[PDB]
Design a protein around this nucleic acid. Structure first.
Length: 144
RNA sequence: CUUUUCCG
């Protein structure tokens, strides 16, 4: 019943419901601050799954921006969802712009003293179906 | 693969 799940059903997505639901999550985040909104978490989660089956560039962009604004504040759930999306989604259907984003954020995450991104990227290669990997990122995987 | 079930 929660829009975060209902919008994931076979034919459950409508523009009206999503926008109303997207608005509430954003408003709650603004009101209670970053890392303090239960909905926003739902929206992050809704995003990583939904985009895997229904890629929308503009939606992915908002997803990506909000996740990185959260992570730089210390609340990394949104970024984990983005990484989960990158690994799971690109596995499902490969997109070069998205994969290039994947490599970029994975490097930034590892350079930030983190392992979540690197582990998700490694997992992608393992379950993925000739790609040009970043040489600096290739070195990071070697020590993983 | 940490984040649901009606506070309109």
């Amino acid at each position: 019943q929660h829009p975060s799940h209902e919008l994931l059903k076979e034919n459950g997505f409508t523009q009206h419901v999503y926008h109303k639901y997207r608005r509430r999550c954003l408003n709650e985040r603004k009101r209670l601050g970053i890392g303090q909104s239960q909905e926003m978490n739902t929206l992050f989660r809704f995003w990583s799954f939904f985009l895997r089956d229904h890629f929308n560039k503009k939606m992915y962009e908002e997803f990506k921006q909000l996740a990185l604004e959260d992570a730089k504040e210390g609340y990394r759930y949104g970024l984990e969802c983005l990484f989960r999306y990158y690994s799971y989604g690109l596995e499902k259907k490969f997109r070069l712009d998205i994969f290039k984003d994947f490599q970029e954020e994975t490097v930034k995450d590892y350079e930030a003293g983190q392992l979540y991104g690197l582990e998700k990227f490694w997992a992608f290669l393992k379950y993925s179906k000739n790609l040009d990997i970043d040489p600096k990122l290739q070195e990071y995987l070697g020590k993983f």
